[PDB]
Amino acid sequence: DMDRFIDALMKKMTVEEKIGQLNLPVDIAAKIKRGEVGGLFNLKGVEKIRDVQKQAVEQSRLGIPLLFGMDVIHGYETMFPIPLGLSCTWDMTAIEESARIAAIEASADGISWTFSPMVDISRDPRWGRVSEGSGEDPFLGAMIAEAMVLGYQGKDMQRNDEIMACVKHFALYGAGEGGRDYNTVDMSRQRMFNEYMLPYEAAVEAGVGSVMASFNEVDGVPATANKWLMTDVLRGQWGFNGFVVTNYTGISEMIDHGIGDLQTVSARAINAGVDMDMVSEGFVSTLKKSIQEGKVSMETLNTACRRILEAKYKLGLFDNPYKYCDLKRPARDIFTKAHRDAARRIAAESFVLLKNDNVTLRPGTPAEPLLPFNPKGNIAVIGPLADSRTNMPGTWSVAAVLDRCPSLVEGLKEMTAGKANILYAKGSNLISDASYEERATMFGRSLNRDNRTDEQLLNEALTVANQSDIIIAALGESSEMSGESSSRTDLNIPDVQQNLLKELLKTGKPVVLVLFTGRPLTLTWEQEHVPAILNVWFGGSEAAYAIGDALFGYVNPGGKLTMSFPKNVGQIPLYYAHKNTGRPLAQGKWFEKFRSNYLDVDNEPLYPFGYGLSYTTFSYGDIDLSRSTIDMTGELTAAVMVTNTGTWPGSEVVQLYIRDLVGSTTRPVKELKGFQKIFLEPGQSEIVRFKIAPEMLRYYNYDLQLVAEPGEFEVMIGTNSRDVKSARFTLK
Amino acid sequence: DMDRFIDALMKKMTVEEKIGQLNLPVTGEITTGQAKSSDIAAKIKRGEVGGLFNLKGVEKIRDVQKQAVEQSRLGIPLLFGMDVIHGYETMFPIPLGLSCTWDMTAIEESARIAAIEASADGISWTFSPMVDISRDPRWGRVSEGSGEDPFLGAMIAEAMVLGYQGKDMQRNDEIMACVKHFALYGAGEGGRDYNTVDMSRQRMFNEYMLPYEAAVEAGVGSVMASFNEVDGVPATANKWLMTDVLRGQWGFNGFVVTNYTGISEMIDHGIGDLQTVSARAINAGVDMDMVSEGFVSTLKKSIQEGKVSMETLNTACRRILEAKYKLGLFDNPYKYCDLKRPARDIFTKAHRDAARRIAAESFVLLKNDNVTLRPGTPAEPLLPFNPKGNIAVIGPLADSRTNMPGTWSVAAVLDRCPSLVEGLKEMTAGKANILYAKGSNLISDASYEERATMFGRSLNRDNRTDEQLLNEALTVANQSDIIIAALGESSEMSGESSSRTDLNIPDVQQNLLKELLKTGKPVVLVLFTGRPLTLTWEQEHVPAILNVWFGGSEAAYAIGDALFGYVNPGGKLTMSFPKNVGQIPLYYAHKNTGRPLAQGKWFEKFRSNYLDVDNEPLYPFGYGLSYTTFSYGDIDLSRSTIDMTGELTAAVMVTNTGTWPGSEVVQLYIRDLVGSTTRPVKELKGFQKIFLEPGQSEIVRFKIAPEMLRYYNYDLQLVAEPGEFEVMIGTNSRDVKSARFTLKL
Numbered sequence A: 001d002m003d004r005f006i007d008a009l010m011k012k013m014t015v016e017e018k019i020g021q022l023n024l025p026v027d028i029a030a031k032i033k034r035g036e037v038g039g040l041f042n043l044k045g046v047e048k049i050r051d052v053q054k055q056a057v058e059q060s061r062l063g064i065p066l067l068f069g070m071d072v073i074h075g076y077e078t079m080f081p082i083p084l085g086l087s088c089t090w091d092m093t094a095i096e097e098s099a100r101i102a103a104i105e106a107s108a109d110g111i112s113w114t115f116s117p118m119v120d121i122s123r124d125p126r127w128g129r130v131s132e133g134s135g136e137d138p139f140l141g142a143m144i145a146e147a148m149v150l151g152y153q154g155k156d157m158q159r160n161d162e163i164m165a166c167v168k169h170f171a172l173y174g175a176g177e178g179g180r181d182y183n184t185v186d187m188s189r190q191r192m193f194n195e196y197m198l199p200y201e202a203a204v205e206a207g208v209g210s211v212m213a214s215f216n217e218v219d220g221v222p223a224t225a226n227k228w229l230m231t232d233v234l235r236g237q238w239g240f241n242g243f244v245v246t247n248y249t250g251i252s253e254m255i256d257h258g259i260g261d262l263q264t265v266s267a268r269a270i271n272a273g274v275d276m277d278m279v280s281e282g283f284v285s286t287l288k289k290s291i292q293e294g295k296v297s298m299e300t301l302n303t304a305c306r307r308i309l310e311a312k313y314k315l316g317l318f319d320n321p322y323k324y325c326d327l328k329r330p331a332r333d334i335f336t337k338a339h340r341d342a343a344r345r346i347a348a349e350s351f352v353l354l355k356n357d358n359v360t361l362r363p364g365t366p367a368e369p370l371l372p373f374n375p376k377g378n379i380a381v382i383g384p385l386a387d388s389r390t391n392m393p394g395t396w397s398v399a400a401v402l403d404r405c406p407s408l409v410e411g412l413k414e415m416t417a418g419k420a421n422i423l424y425a426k427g428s429n430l431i432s433d434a435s436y437e438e439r440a441t442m443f444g445r446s447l448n449r450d451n452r453t454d455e456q457l458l459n460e461a462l463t464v465a466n467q468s469d470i471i472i473a474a475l476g477e478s479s480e481m482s483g484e485s486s487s488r489t490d491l492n493i494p495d496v497q498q499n500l501l502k503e504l505l506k507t508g509k510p511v512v513l514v515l516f517t518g519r520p521l522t523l524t525w526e527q528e529h530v531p532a533i534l535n536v537w538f539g540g541s542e543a544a545y546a547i548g549d550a551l552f553g554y555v556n557p558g559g560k561l562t563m564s565f566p567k568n569v570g571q572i573p574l575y576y577a578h579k580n581t582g583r584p585l586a587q588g589k590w591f592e593k594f595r596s597n598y599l600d601v602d603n604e605p606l607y608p609f610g611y612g613l614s615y616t617t618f619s620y621g622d623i624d625l626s627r628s629t630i631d632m633t634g635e636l637t638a639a640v641m642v643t644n645t646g647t648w649p650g651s652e653v654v655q656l657y658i659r660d661l662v663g664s665t666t667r668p669v670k671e672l673k674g675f676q677k678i679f680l681e682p683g684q685s686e687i688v689r690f691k692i693a694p695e696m697l698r699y700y701n702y703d704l705q706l707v708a709e710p711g712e713f714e715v716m717i718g719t720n721s722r723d724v725k726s727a728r729f730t731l732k
Numbered sequence B: 001d002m003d004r005f006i007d008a009l010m011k012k013m014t015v016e017e018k019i020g021q022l023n024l025p026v027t028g029e030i031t032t033g034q035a036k037s038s039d040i041a042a043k044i045k046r047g048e049v050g051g052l053f054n055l056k057g058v059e060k061i062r063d064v065q066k067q068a069v070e071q072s073r074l075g076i077p078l079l080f081g082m083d084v085i086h087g088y089e090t091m092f093p094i095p096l097g098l099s100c101t102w103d104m105t106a107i108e109e110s111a112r113i114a115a116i117e118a119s120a121d122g123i124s125w126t127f128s129p130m131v132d133i134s135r136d137p138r139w140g141r142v143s144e145g146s147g148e149d150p151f152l153g154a155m156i157a158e159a160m161v162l163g164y165q166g167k168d169m170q171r172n173d174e175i176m177a178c179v180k181h182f183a184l185y186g187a188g189e190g191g192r193d194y195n196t197v198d199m200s201r202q203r204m205f206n207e208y209m210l211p212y213e214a215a216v217e218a219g220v221g222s223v224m225a226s227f228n229e230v231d232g233v234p235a236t237a238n239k240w241l242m243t244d245v246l247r248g249q250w251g252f253n254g255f256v257v258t259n260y261t262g263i264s265e266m267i268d269h270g271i272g273d274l275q276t277v278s279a280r281a282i283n284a285g286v287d288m289d290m291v292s293e294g295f296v297s298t299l300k301k302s303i304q305e306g307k308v309s310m311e312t313l314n315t316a317c318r319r320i321l322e323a324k325y326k327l328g329l330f331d332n333p334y335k336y337c338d339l340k341r342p343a344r345d346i347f348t349k350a351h352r353d354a355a356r357r358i359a360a361e362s363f364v365l366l367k368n369d370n371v372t373l374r375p376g377t378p379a380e381p382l383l384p385f386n387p388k389g390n391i392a393v394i395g396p397l398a399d400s401r402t403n404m405p406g407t408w409s410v411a412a413v414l415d416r417c418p419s420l421v422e423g424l425k426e427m428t429a430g431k432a433n434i435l436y437a438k439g440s441n442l443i444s445d446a447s448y449e450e451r452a453t454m455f456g457r458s459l460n461r462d463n464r465t466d467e468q469l470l471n472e473a474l475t476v477a478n479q480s481d482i483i484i485a486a487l488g489e490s491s492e493m494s495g496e497s498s499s500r501t502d503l504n505i506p507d508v509q510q511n512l513l514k515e516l517l518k519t520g521k522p523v524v525l526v527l528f529t530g531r532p533l534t535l536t537w538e539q540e541h542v543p544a545i546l547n548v549w550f551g552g553s554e555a556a557y558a559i560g561d562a563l564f565g566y567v568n569p570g571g572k573l574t575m576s577f578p579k580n581v582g583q584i585p586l587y588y589a590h591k592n593t594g595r596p597l598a599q600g601k602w603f604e605k606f607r608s609n610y611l612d613v614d615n616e617p618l619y620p621f622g623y624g625l626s627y628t629t630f631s632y633g634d635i636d637l638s639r640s641t642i643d644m645t646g647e648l649t650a651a652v653m654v655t656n657t658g659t660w661p662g663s664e665v666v667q668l669y670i671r672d673l674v675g676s677t678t679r680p681v682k683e684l685k686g687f688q689k690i691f692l693e694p695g696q697s698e699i700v701r702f703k704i705a706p707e708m709l710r711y712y713n714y715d716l717q718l719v720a721e722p723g724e725f726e727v728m729i730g731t732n733s734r735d736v737k738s739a740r741f742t743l744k745l
C-alpha cells in the first residue's frame, strides 16, 4: 500500500528534503548527498546511471532513488521515423510497437522516464516542432497519444522494460504566432477544447504518468504558472493523478515573459500545480523563503512532493532502485537486428507517395510510372541528402549513433550490388547561404561543405546524370531545419537544390524526387514538373534501406499525410477541419469577387489532409447507412465496399469524416472520426464498416458543455479528406 | 419630446409596419455586393422599408423620400445610406494612408467635407468609420482602417465620428455615422477576407476593441455588425457582442445594422435556416436587416410562434425611429433633399485644395539616400528636386486617372482625377519636359489584371508585348535626367474581397524597375499601395522611395508638391511592413515571450527566432523620414515615483538638425515591465506632431497618469497595477529614448 509507505517516508522529511524531490537539475554528487535532487535528465549509459543511483540510495539521509529522464522521441538507438512521418502510417499497432521497442532499449540503458509523446496540434508548418508531433488533427492525434503511452508504459509500468511517459507540451504550444518557436499563443476556450486539447486528454486518460508544461503563454499567463491549465483542466476536468514537470528553465523564463522575479514566479508555478522544476532551481533556491512568508503553504509543498514520490513508487523504484540498471541488458536489447528490421518496415510504411505520373520511357509504348522500378543499369543518386549518414535519422535522435546510419547512396549500393551501378554526385550545397547551412546542420549534421561553387557542383552532377538511366534526386531539408528553434518563413526546397532539380529535369532523363523533410513544404513547382515525388520525411536509422524497399517495389507506399501541404506561405493557416464562413467559395469558382478567397491563389492546399497514393488504385462504392435516423441512445453502421482496381497488392487508409450540418455554433466542414487501414490483393474487395454513435457526435458548445445536438449529419468516407463518398442521417 | 412622439407613432403601427422599419433593401447604380433588391416602390407604399443605400443623387433621393412621406400610410421617412469612406466627390487619401498624417484635425476636416458633400446630395447616413484593427497585411481591407494600433485607431475613430456628425447631427451638413465592423473582422484567418476569427477575451479587449468603444463614446449613431464569427457565433447573432458589450458595458444608445446580406450569410456559416438566424439576430441586438430580407419575410411567423417577442420587435423598431428623429427627419423629411446644394457644395476648389494638402501630408518617405549626380559635386538626396530638364514618368500607375482615388470611392467621378503625368505636366509647364511610357502591365497574368482593375479601374491593357512596353520605356529613360517610377498596386488590389498571399510589387513592374535602375539614371520609386508590401529588394536597390498610398482625387498634384519640395514629407507608418509574408503577423506591441532574442543577436539557437530572416519588420510602426533630420535629447521625468492619485510629466527636447523646415511626429510609448499577465514590450500612449524650422528646438511634454497605465487583466478587470514602468519617446516605435518610473498604491 503506497499511501502508508509514502505517509511514513514524508513524516521523516525535512522541508529541504521535500523541496529537493521537486528539483530536476542539469557538484551534482554534493546535491544528491544533501537530498536536493528528485531526478536527472539526458544522462546516457547504464553504468553512469547505476553509479549516480548508488549515491542517492546509500549516501543521502533518506536514500530516496532518482528518476532518470531522456528525450526518447522516436527511438533510443534504433531510430524509427520522426513522429510526423510515423503518424502517416495511420497504424496504431506499429506506433505502439515503435514505442515498446524504444522503451525496451532505453530501459536496458538505465532510463526510467521518457519526455514523450509530443502531442501538440499545429496548423502552422513554419514551426520546426511539427516534426515531433502527429499533424493537424485531434482525433488521430489522440489515437496516437494513447498508442505511444501504452507502448512505453504498458498496463502499469511493473515490467523492467516499461518506463514512465510524459505527455508534452501542455498546452497549445503549436499555435505560436508567426510559427516562430516560443512565440505568443492566443485562442478562445472553445477552440482549445474542440481543436487543440483532445490529444493531451487522451494521454491522461491512457494513464500517462507525467505531463510537461509548455514554454508559451496561454490567456496571458505562461503555461508553467497557469493554474486554470495545470489544476482546473488537468486535475479538475480530466482526473490526472500524476505529476507536472516544467520544460527546460520554464520557471526562470517566466521572468523574461514579464510576470515577476524568480521567487514570485516559482511560488506561482507550484501553486498552479507544477510539481518538478527542470533546471531553473527556482524551487530549490526560493521555496523555503516562500513558505516562511506565507506565499506557498506546507500543504502545497507536501502535495507536490507526494506526487513525485508516488511516481517513483509506481515505477517500482522503492522496491528496487536499480530496476533499470542491469549491465547485461544493453548487449541484449539495444540496436538488435530484430529492432532494426521493425524500424525498416515502419519507415517504409511511413512514406507518402505524392505523385507518380506516367512517363514515356520506351519509344512507341504507352506511358508508365517511374515507381516502382527494377534495380538495374545506371542509377544516379544526386543531391545534398544523397550521401549523408548523420541526416538520415531525423532531429530528436539524441541517443542515436549518427554516423552509423547508412547514407542513401550506401544503402542503395548494398541493395543493388551486382544488379546496378549507383552513381553519386553531391549536386548542390544544402542552401546558397553558408551561414544558414551551418545553423541548419548543427548537432553533428555537417554535409562537409567545401570551396566548390554551386556551378562546379551542378556541372559534376549533370556529367553523372547524363551517364544514367534514371535519376534519384535526394533533396529537401537537413534534419535540423526542423525540431526545436527551427522555424522557417519560406517552405521551399532550398534555392540551390531546386535549381539543381530544374537542371536534372532538363537532361531529359527520368527524375524521381525523394523528398526529405520534417514539415510540410510548398511544392507547386515540383508537382507541375517532376514525374514522381516520394516524401520520405526522415525515416530513421534504417531510412536508406526503407527507401530502397519503396523505390524497387518491395513495399507498396501507403502513407497518408497528417498535415495539409499549402501552395504558399500566404495561405497559412490552412487546415481541412475549417469553418464554412458566411461567404464560402464554391468548388471550381475561383476567383469570385465577394467570396472568401484570395486574388492570387485558390483556397486549396496542394495536398490535403489524408492524401497519399499507392502503386495500385482503390475504388469506393456508395455508402450504406444501416439507419437513416437514430436517437440519443442509438447507433448505426456506415459501410462502404473498397476494391483494389489496379495491378499491385497494397494498403489503403479508409478515412471516416463527419460534418454536423447545423450547429448552435459554427461547426467544421468535416472532422475525422475514424479510420481503418486495409490490405487488398489485386481485384479483391472489402466491406469496411464504421460504428457511429452519439458520443462521437459530441462537441464543446458556446458554454463549453460537451454535447451532441439533434439534427442532421453528413457521413463521409474516402481515400483522403477531399475525395469522399457521402451519406446523411438524422440525430433525434 | 422624442419619447412621447415615438410612443404615439408606435401606437399606430401594425406589426408589419414595425418590421418594415427594420428593412434595408439595396438600390441605385452602386455595386458593393452580389445580392440585389426587387419591388421597392410597392414595398415603400406598404411601409415595408426603413431605409435604402447605394442610391446616388439628390433628385432620385428626393423622389423616393416623397414616395415614403406622401404615399405610405404613416409617412415615415427613409434613411439614405452610402459608403462615404474617404470622400464623396472630393477624394481624400484612403483611410490607411490618411492615418499616416497622425493629424486628428485634418482627419476630422476630411470627414467634415465628405459630410458637407454627401448631405448636399441627399445622403443622411455613412457606413463609416471602418476601425477594424489588423496585424495582417494580406487582408485587403487594411486600406479602409487606420492600422495596427488601438490607441491611434481610437483617436481617429473619434475624429471621424465628430467630423461626420458634429455635436448632435442637427445641421443640414451633418450626417449619421456608422462604426464598422463590430467586431474583430481584421483578424480573419490567413488574411483571407471573411474567414474565421478566433481569440481570447483578453486579446479582444486589450488589442482589438478600443476603437469601436471610442466611436460609441463619441456618440456614433449606428454600428454595423461584421461578417465573421466570434467564439463560433456569427457576429450578427452574437448577443454577447451586440447586447452585453455594446449596450450593457458601453451604454450604446443607437442601432445596429447588419452588413450586406449578413443575416442570410448565417445560413452558410451553419447555424440555421433564414427564420432561425433572423430570430437570433434580432434577439442578439441587431436592429436593421441590410438586403437579406430575413426580418421582413420571417419575423411575423417568429412572433406568432414565440421565437421573438413583441417587446424585442418594439425595441428594435424604436431604435430606428429614434435615429430618424435625432437626424431631424420627422421635423423635415427633406432636410438633405435640397436640389440646389450640389451645385455649390460638391467638388469645390476649397474642398479640393484641402484634399491636396491632406494628401501630401499622408505620404511616407521610406528612403532618400544620397546620390552622386555629377562627378566632383558632393552627393545629395534625389528628393526634393527642382523641376527642370527631362523628367521621365514611367509605369502602369504613371498615366491612370481612375486609379488615383483609391478603393472605396463609389461616388467619385473616376476619370476626372488628373493622372500623375497630367499633374506633373501642369506643375512643370515651361520648366521641364515630362516624358512618358507605360513600361509594363500591372501584372503578367491578364486574368489577375482584370480582377485587380474592376469597378472602372482598367489600365487599358492592350495587346502589346512586354518587350514593346519595356523597350519604349528604356528609350524614354535613357533620354531623361531623372526617372519617376510610378509602380505598385492598382486600387482594387485592396478593399473588400481583395486579399493577397504575395505582397510584392507585381512581377512585370519589378522587372521594369530593375531595368530602369540598370540605365544608371536616378530612379525615384513613387509607390502606390493599399497595404504594407514586402520591399526588401527595393529598400536595397532604389535610392528614393515615397509611399503615396492612394492619395485621392488630387493625388497627382500632392505628389508633385512632395517631389518638388513644396511640402516636406512627414507621414509615419501606422502598420508594420514585413520583410516577408512568413513573418506575419508582425506588430510592434508584442509580448516578450519567455525566450526573447537580444538585439543584434540574430540568429541564436533556442531563442524565439527564425532560421532564415530576423524578427524585425523592414519598416516598423511609426516609421517615416523627412527632408530634414530631428535629434532627441534625454527624457526628463518630473517624478520618479507616483501613486494612483498622482501624475508626472515626461519631456524631451526635439531639434531640427537638418537644412529643411519640417514636421516630426513625436511618439510616446509605455512599457508595463511586470504584470500579473504578460504585458507588451511597448504600447503607444500619446503623440504630438510638431513643426520645426532648421536649427529650431522644442520641448515636447507628455502627461502620464495612472489611468493611461490600465489594462484588462486575467479576470477582464480594467486596472493599473503598481510596479515599474518604462517611458519611451522617439521618431518611430523602434528608435526611442528611455526612462523609468515606479507606480505605488
Ligand SMILES: OC[C@H]1O[C@@H](O[C@H]2[C@H](O[C@@H]3[C@@H](O)[C@H](O)[C@@H](CO)O[C@H]3O)O[C@H](CO)[C@@H](O)[C@@H]2O)[C@H](O)[C@@H](O)[C@@H]1O
Residues within 6 Å of the ligand: A041, A042, A070, A071, A115, A168, A247, A248, A398, A484, B606
Ligand atoms: O530534454 C528535456 C527537454 O529539453 C528541451 O530542449 C532544451 C534543450 O535540451 C537539450 C535536450 O532537449 C536534449 O535531449 C539533450 C541531449 O542531447 O540536450 C539538452 O541540452 O536544451 C536547450 C538548452 O541548450 C534548451 O533551450 C531547450 O529548451 C525540449 O524543449 C523538451 O521537449 C525536452 O523534453
Ligand SMILES: OC[C@H]1O[C@@H](O)[C@H](O)[C@@H](O)[C@@H]1O
Residues within 6 Å of the ligand: B032, B033, B053, B082, B083, B127, B180, B259, B260, B496
Ligand atoms: O454599402 C454597404 C456595405 O457594402 C459592403 O459591400 C461592404 O462590405 C460594407 O463595408 C459596406 O458598408
Ligand SMILES: [Mg+2]
Residues within 6 Å of the ligand: A660, A661, A662, A663, A709, A710, A711, A712
Ligand atoms: Mg447539428
Ligand SMILES: [Mg+2]
Residues within 6 Å of the ligand: B672, B673, B674, B675, B721, B722, B723, B724
Ligand atoms: Mg506592472
